[PDB]
């Protein structure tokens, strides 16, 4: 089965990078290129699965369209001190009270990680809103980036 999940970040977030990272991609060749969608399969439990991602640009608000999904990916950068907030406001926003789950994931993980500019912190923000931990992410790796978080995301996105 196909399942779909909604990259949500700000600009220069990592978007991009979570995308070209399902396709297999480090960060090294990633710079080498000159689609806002990624497909590819993945594995759960031993079966065959499809996980398609969505890149949702930063703006002011989500249409209709754009919130519906099995899954959301709220990513922010841990070197950027306002990406968070920007995640915490679209969650309140579209998915609070949309029944549909949500993993936070905090990219550029190779990066130094600063203080977010929000008053609740990224691990107290997953706690209080029953989520999973904020999932550790980098695609600037050496071989092909790890697949741990989109085997989590299309665990997630099999909820009924
Ligand atoms: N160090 C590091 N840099 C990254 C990573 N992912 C993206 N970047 C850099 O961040 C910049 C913008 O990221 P991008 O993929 O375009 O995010 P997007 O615009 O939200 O889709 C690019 O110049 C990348 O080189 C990462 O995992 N580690
Ligand atoms: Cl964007």
Known sequence: NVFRCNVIGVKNCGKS???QALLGRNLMRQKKIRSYY?????????????????????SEFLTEAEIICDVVCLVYDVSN????EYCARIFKQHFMDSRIPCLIVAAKSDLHEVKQEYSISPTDFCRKHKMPPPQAFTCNTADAPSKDIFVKLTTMAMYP
């Open 17 to 19: 990078g979570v995308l």
């Open 38 to 58: 990624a497909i590819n399969t993945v594995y759960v439990y031993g079966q065959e699965k499809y996980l398609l991602l969505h890149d949702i640009s930063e």
């Open 81 to 84: 001190p306002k990406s968070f």
